Design a protein around this ligand. Structure first.
Ligand SMILES: C[C@H]1CCC[C@H](C[C@H]2Cc3cc(O)cc(O)c3C(=O)O2)O1
Ligand SMILES: C[C@H]1CCC[C@H](C[C@H]2Cc3cc(O)cc(O)c3C(=O)O2)O1
Lengths: 485, 486
């Protein structure tokens, strides 16, 4: 019962049985059935009923072991479990002696089993092996039920987590049918999945640097998928999307990972109205798809504290950033914008409310600060859009038709943090401040080639999974989060 | 022929002159009744010269051709198909603007919204008759012709041109997407579980390929881009996901050629309680069913040589030939290599073989890479008419694969080849920690200590397969934005 000594004992076990000719790691075991299939077929039987003349070969890992004439194990696989009832009478003795063969089995051992299904004495569904073979041996003591969490090796060694905690398994299953539902959701609308370079010549933001040796160029990992997708829009693909890894060099956080999965799509002849309805539809239908209801409960502060219900029933509240800033601070900010006096105006708003006064105090920064202290968590109760950002804050999104100095842009916040960001792209090459005379330039040139009016959108899939799987950290919804050794 | 530069200038001037008149050359929203392929489908079979004059639609498109009175013709393309735009003076709504100038404004490459009614030309091909046509997004360049692209840098560098003009290219990439979709669904239907793995590992590259190196500054940690998805996936098999797979980008740093590029999409899966016979049936089934899915037949024509040159026909009808590598080498060279293997005598023997026969190039002389080289010359190009397996590689050549049951010094391993190129790689994983050579990465060797079931695993170059199914001699053709020096 000292895990190092246990490890040593089991290693020695392995070799002295290899010495007897028995191989503890056999090459192949033909599998007739899987534990869930097993359950589904045989779940309805009488209590104490055996069916002894259909012989099955089933496999799994032994997660519970209990002990002359009988042995009970708990065999698990595919996140589900059946009991293993070994009877002396049914055992095929010529394969090996009963005692010796079933004494070799320890918890965590992966075994093949030849036997017949039936339910137990009072009829818990079980398989009765005529013989039990060791497919792979576990050399370590598996941590017990609550042995992990806090742990945090759980991120380092994930397999242990997936074995012991069901919640993580369930979490990841959920993650991939979130992505599944997203991909299908898009595909059904005629969207087109593509792959875009992860190493680009030009990369404004905080990148990684990598180097190709023989091409002898230093390249940067992508901060987003946007530009080449828009170039694809220019190319005749008018509905296009990509689900892929994106990279940023900034610091790690609860909600931040250097490596995060994003879904960015571009949609021709659509503006942020169709994008908003797209968001409402997607999130509503997704939440209903998972939970059979639009209402979910999410624990923001710990598990130990009162959750908050989040209602994904559409439509979601839309808040003009500037307007409600102007209403709450009760000053008329602008007329637009960065503009000297208004700067000063904004700055004083920042000081009296004892907010950060971020430096350098340019206008965009001040607007971001103001907008987030005031607006960003205004509504927790459900996802809400922050709309019509100033176009000093958004030198991509096209100018708002009616409201000048603003953009057509929407940013969807769930539970105080950013999830979705979508805007109508600016297709006028003369109105893009970014294109300079003497890559990104390929996008500007493609822009000279007449990109149609198009709305774009991008997603937080890691964070979305966080909220839908009810987790407070991004590392819980990621299989192997990046960590320092 | 006109000069491109001042054409560009001319319509830039056009654009802001149009802005000076209050007109917006880049409108915010055009709302669309119908998309061109839907248009096509609905109205194809209208009688010649038939006209639905009560039905008014708003349709968008890009102008790819223009004819010069009171009558105008265009080719409106979108979503891969084409309708003609018949602008009749008598039909055109004059209240919005003058016919002449409104339609003298439109020139090739422009993206226009069109409000008008469907019909068919008296000559009998489908047409949209605008009562009104508005400019959505203007194109400032002449655009090239079917001459313009292939063969060219800008076919790759400016991709949108390739997709617009060539009309072959986007069929290619559609195909790539249908390949990958078909693969994902193919795996999903078998109870496989898609996952996402780190693209950045502390693990370096591998003996075969140099690593891409990057650095995370705040953790002050040197990270290496993944050369394969294998290790975390196998760790997931330890974790209780018995059928797992990932389709994603994979990074190798070696040189660039037609069949190789540094950043390529691969698909790798791991299958518990499966041995490679399951894997070969899997390979044969995937490829057979796939080729039939796309082409309606099991045989496809690929040009091993250039387009001018005679294409060979490849037959994907299973089962495919299995060729034991060492034994085949022995049979063709008519020398008995081994018994095993890296024997100084045997290494010498192999060298003598390569130089004496082929004058094929010796290399830094590892026994493994020797075997690989002789294999490369002799066996690989044997079958170009059918996809074929090179099977049972010696374990010196394959550290990860499990030992062959009945044959010493060999592994249970397959490698599938199309036209002499390496498409698919699979083997039965070696789950014994003590048998394992590396354990004498650490996280994987430790994963084995909690036990890993008998598993088998496979990986797919997607880009190459896409080449062979889309008939391309270079991988740069099936990758949307290939990497090139500017
Ligand atoms: C592509 C964008 C669109 C807006 C929401 C979301 C923002 C994104 C920012 C971001 C930055 C970072 O360094 C690490 C991360 O995990 C994230 C994230 O998940 O959310 O995804
Ligand atoms: C995952 C693997 C399995 C075997 C086929 C294929 C091999 C791979 C080799 C390879 C190496 C390299 O440095 C650059 C490349 O573009 C490729 C490739 O396309 O195919 O994919």
């Amino acid at each position: 019962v000292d895990p190092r000594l246990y490890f040593e004992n089991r290693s020695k076990f392995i070799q002295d049985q290899k010495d007897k000719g028995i191989n503890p790691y056999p090459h192949k075991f033909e599998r007739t059935i899987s534990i869930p299939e097993f359950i589904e077929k045989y779940k309805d039987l009488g209590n104490g009923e055996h069916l002894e003349d259909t012989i099955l070969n089933i496999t799994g890992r032994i997660m519970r072991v209990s002990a002359q004439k009988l042995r009970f194990f708990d065999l698990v696989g595919d996140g589900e479990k059946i009991q293993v009832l070994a009877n002396y009478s049914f055992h095929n003795h010529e394969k090996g002696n009963f005692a010796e063969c079933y004494d070799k089995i320890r918890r965590g051992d992966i075994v093949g089993i030849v036997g017949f299904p039936g339910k137990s004495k009072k009829g818990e569904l079980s398989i009765f092996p005529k013989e039990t073979i060791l497919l792979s041996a576990c050399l370590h003591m598996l941590p017990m039920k609550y042995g992990l969490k806090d742990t945090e090796i759980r991120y380092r060694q994930r397999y242990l987590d997936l074995l012991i905690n069901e919640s993580s398994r369930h979490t990841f299953v959920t993650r991939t049918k979130i992505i599944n539902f997203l991909r299908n959701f898009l595909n059904e609308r005629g969207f087109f999945e593509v792959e875009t370079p992860m190493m680009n010549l030009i990369a404004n933001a905080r990148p990684f640097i990598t180097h190709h040796n023989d091409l002898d160029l230093d390249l940067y990992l992508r901060i987003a998928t946007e530009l080449p997708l828009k170039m694809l829009i220019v190319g005749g693909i008018d509905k296009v999307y990509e689900i892929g890894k994106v990279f940023r060099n900034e610091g790690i956080d609860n909600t931040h990972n250097p490596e995060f999965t994003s879904c960015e799509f571009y949609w021709a002849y659509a503006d942020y109205n169709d994008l908003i309805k797209w968001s409402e539809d997607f999130f509503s239908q997704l939440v209903y798809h998972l939970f059979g209801t639009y209402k979910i409960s999410y624990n923001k502060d710990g598990p130990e504290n009162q959750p908050i219900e989040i209602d994904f029933t559409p439509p979601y509240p839309k808040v003009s950033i500037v307007e409600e800033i102007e209403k709450v601070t009760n000053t008329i900010l602008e007329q637009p914008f960065d503009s000297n006096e208004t700067i000063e105006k904004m700055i004083n708003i920042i000081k009296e409310h004892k907010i950060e006064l971020p430096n350098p105090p340019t206008a965009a920064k001040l607007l971001d600060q103001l907008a987030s202290h005031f607006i960003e968590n205004k509504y927790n109760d459900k996802p809400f859009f922050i709309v019509e950002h100033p176009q000093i804050m958004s030198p991509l999104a096209k100018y708002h038709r009616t409201k000048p100095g603003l953009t057509e842009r929407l940013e969807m916040f769930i539970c105080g943090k950013e999830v979705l960001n979508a805007y109508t792209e600016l297709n006028d090459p003369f109105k893009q401040k970014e294109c300079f005379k003497l890559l990104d330039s390929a996008f500007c040139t493609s822009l000279e080639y007449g990109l149609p009016p198009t709305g774009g959108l991008g997603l937080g899939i890691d964070r979305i999974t966080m909220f839908l799987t009810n987790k407070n950290s991004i590392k819980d919804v990621i299989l192997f989060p990046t960590m320092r050794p």
